[PDB]
Write a protein that binds this ligand. Structure first.
Ligand SMILES: Nc1nc2c(ncn2[C@@H]2O[C@H](COP(=O)(O)OP(=O)(O)NP(=O)(O)O)[C@@H](O)[C@H]2O)c(=O)[nH]1
Lengths: 433, 113, 9
């Protein structure tokens, strides 16, 4: 209710069968579709997002509303605009001589990164991407190619390609890059994708990016009907030192919902929850239980929250469990809905053929990304595209789900490849009735 | 008068099931109900699960007893509610030196968030 | 694709 210009969501009326990624109820307040920003260092990734949204934000999330002027007298592309998530769903036009209101068409979230790991393990569901390519450099730069291989792997079809920094670059040189791009995407999953020139710095042609975000990127399918699951990507203690007792507040779980809807006052559990070590060192896991106290997407309060965006969940849970991201890696959802808890995985796996900036061995050290959980893991057995891992920390996850693998190369972590889970070993949860 | 003395205990309070902080609130509120007209009690958070319990008294003995009683009330309630209690510091008199080591560590803990 | 296979095995 805290924002009276926006949709009055209501749990008495909510019909989850009737939700769509464009339902104004929802879109008024939260983003419903996620757009990754990918490229190379200094190619303007974060800066494009900052230009579209106004936001200044291991992953990072920024929502932006996208509007169309309801005037026939609009010259293209200036029919389109973008704004911060808290802005009203209609406003009168800026553009002189044009008449009527901008009206909200779409509300999107930009999933910015310093990225390959998160892409391959599906920790950040990207419904689409912006491939940024700086004109002042050639195509592809190393990360640019690496990212495009990552896109091919993730099978994301809908893409926009952004030639950035055109403020620095003369038209002759600008067009000289264009064929490099065209050739580089030819033979790849990006082959059909639009190329748009922009300046993130001077905010040239941003309207076009918005136009093509509305037009090229279709409404993705969603699972609103299942019981929900969220991945905890951040967790917070909101209580500032000095706190008096009545003013103590819950720990807050922040994540991207994958399915279902969270509702205020819904009862939830978290897996694996609290990890504890038995007499014989044997792992034992107690799921955390609680109640949703409140819901947020950025500065917008919600009574229900739906996949897309990063959604903040207020809870009863003692802050000691949420503080300084202690719950990151956990899965959150409705009671009895959550996946099984695993300590060992059999996986089918695939590696980077290029030694970018070789195959497995037994008892090899790995760090492994499953959902938001970077855990230590160690190899148990090996074949040419199949093997087995034992995990340092237990995880909550699904058979078939993607996971990503890193080795301590040059004495520090680099990704080497990925796999699907095909079988695994689970902990029985211990619940005190 | 033996000019009024400031007395403090550090207490660690927690709950890891359904009622979570609403249980912890209730405990610490029972704590506050142990305050006396001549001796109010104040609880303020340090950083979970640790909290600071303070009182002003004209005699050490009376204040140290009051806090040490309230500590028990609190322990009973959180333990009644599947939760946890620990004493990080049995109640001393607070030197304002000790109080600065607190106030500085509370700013440290703001920065750690 | 050959492009993917140049980067994967
Ligand atoms: N978009 C854009 N960025 C520019 C331009 N000229 C310089 N920059 C640099 O862009 C930076 C801001 O964003 P940038 O780092 O390029 O984005 P990024 O790709 O997200 N970097 P990272 O991969 O580290 O997140 C500034 O440090 C600035 O110096 C320009 O014309 N356009």
């Amino acid at each position: 209710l805290g924002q009276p210009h926006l949709s009055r969501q209501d749990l008495t009326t909510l019909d989850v069968t009737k939700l769509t990624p464009l339902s104004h109820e929802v879109i008024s307040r939260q983003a419903t579709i996620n757009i990754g920003t990918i490229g190379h260092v200094a190619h303007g990734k974060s800066t494009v997002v900052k230009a579209i949204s106004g936001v200044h934000t291991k992953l990072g999330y920024a929502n932006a509303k996208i509007y169309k002027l309801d005037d026939p007298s609009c010259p293209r592309p200036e029919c389109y605009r973008s704004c911060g998530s808290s802005t009203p769903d209609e406003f009168p036009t800026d553009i002189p001589g044009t008449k009527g209101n901008f009206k909200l068409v779409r509300h999107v979230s930009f999933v910015d990164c310093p990225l390959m790991a998160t892409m391959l393990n599906g920790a950040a569901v990207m419904d689409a991407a912006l491939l940024l390519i700086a004109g002042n450099e050639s195509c592809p730069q190393p990360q640019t190619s690496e990212h495009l291989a990552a896109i091919e792997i993730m099978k994301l079809k809908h893409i926009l390609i952004l030639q950035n920094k055109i403020d620095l670059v003369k038209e002759s040189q600008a067009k000289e890059q264009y064929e490099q791009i065209l050739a580089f995407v030819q033979g790849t999953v990006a082959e059909g994708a639009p190329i748009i020139p922009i300046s993130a710095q001077l905010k040239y042609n941003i309207e076009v990016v918005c136009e093509y975000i509305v037009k090229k990127i279709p409404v993705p399918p969603r699972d609103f009907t299942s019981e929900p699951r969220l991945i905890v990507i951040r967790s917070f203690d909101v209580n500032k030192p000095g706190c008096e007792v009545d003013d103590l507040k819950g720990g807050v779980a922040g994540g991207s919902i994958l399915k279902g809807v969270l509702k205020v006052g819904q009862e939830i559990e978290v897996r694996p929850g609290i990890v504890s070590k038995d007499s014989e060192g044997k792992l034992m896991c107690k799921p955390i239980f609680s109640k949703i106290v409140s819901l947020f997407a950025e500065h917008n309060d919600l009574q229900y929250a739906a996949p897309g965006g990063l959604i903040g969940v207020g809870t009863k849970i003692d802050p000691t469990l949420c503080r300084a991201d202690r719950m990151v890696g956990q899965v959150l959802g409705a009671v009895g809905a959550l996946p099984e808890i695993f300590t060992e995985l059999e996986i089918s796996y695939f590696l980077l053929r290029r030694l970018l900036g070789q195959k497995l061995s037994k008892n090899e050290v790995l760090m492994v990304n499953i959902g938001s959980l970077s855990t230590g893991g160690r190899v148990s057995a090996v074949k040419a595209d199949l093997g087995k891992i034992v995990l340092t920390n237990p995880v909550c996850t699904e058979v078939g789900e993607k996971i990503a693998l890193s080795r301590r190369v040059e004495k520090h972590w680099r990704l080497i490849g990925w796999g699907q889970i095909r079988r695994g070993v689970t902990i029985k949860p211990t619940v005190d009735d | 008068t033996p000019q009024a003395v400031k007395i403090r205990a550090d207490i660690e309070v927690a709950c890891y099931g359904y009622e979570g902080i609403d249980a912890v609130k209730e405990a610490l509120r029972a704590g506050l109900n142990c305050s006396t007209e001549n001796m109010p009690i104040k609880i303020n958070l340090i950083a979970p699960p640790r909290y600071v319990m303070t009182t002003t008294t004209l005699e050490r003995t009376e204040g140290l007893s009051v806090l040490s009683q309230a500590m028990a009330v609190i322990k009973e309630k959180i333990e009644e509610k599947r939760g946890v209690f620990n004493v990080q510091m049995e109640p001393k008199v607070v030197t304002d030196t000790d109080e600065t080591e607190l106030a500085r560590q509370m700013e440290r803990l703001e920065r750690e968030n | 694709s050959a492009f993917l296979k140049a980067w994967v095995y």
